[PDB]
Each structure stands twice: as C-alpha cells, then as structure tokens.
Amino acid sequence: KIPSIATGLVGALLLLLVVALGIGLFIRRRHIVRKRTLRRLLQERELVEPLTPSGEKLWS
Amino acid sequence: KIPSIATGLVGALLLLLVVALGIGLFIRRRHIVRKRTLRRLLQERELVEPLTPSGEKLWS
Secondary structure: OOOHHHHHHHHHHHHHHHHHHHHHHHHHOHHHHOOOOOOOOOOHHHHOOOOOOOOOOOOO | OOOHHHHHHHHHHHHHHHHHHHHHHHHHOHHHHOOOOOOOOOOHHHHOOOOOOOOOOOOO
16 A cells, blocks of 8 residues: 555654754754853864973073 | 554664764764863853952052
8 A cells, every 4th residue: 555665764754854853953052052162162272282381491 | 564653663763773873973982082171161161260350459
C-alpha cells in the first residue's frame, strides 16, 4: 500500500527537523543574550598570551 | 508484511544515533584539546568583573 523507503525518511527527517529547529533556535537565542567577552577572549586567550620579561635583566 | 510504525522509528532512531554519535564524539574530543581558560574566564567574565575606584577621591 505504501513504500517502506518513505516511511523511514519521514520519521528521521521530521524528527531531525523538530530537534534541529528546537535545539537550533534554543542555542541561537543564547548568542544574543550572551556577552562578546568570551569571543574577545576566545581568540585572545587561544594563542595570544602575553610573554614579556618583568624582572630578568634588572632582577636576579 | 511489515508495520509502518517500526519503519519510521528505525530511520529516525538510526539517523539520530549516527548523527549524535559522530557529532557527539566530534565535540567531546575537542574538550580535551581545548584550554580551561575559557571556563576560568567563562564564569569569571560572566558576572565577576572588577569594579573599584582607581582615581575618584584622590583624582578630580
């Protein structure tokens, strides 16, 4: 009566669409309520750390 | 010959399992290669910002 190929796609595509829409909209809404200090520090603390002598030549 | 209720579950459950396993193991492996400076700063820059007078009473 009905194809077994569409019965599986509808289940996964519909389940994936609902989960992606909910979880996607749930996390996408947190980016607007979050601060940009973790991004300004995300790339800053990643490989941009300060490394200078504060007391090696003038201090023993 | 076969139930249309299981044909959908197998598609979504199998697709969700493969996507969750791959994406899950893909992100879970990044936590071990990532630094804890974004977590030490995640809760530090969240609501733990410094606010003290550096020049208000002794400076005009």
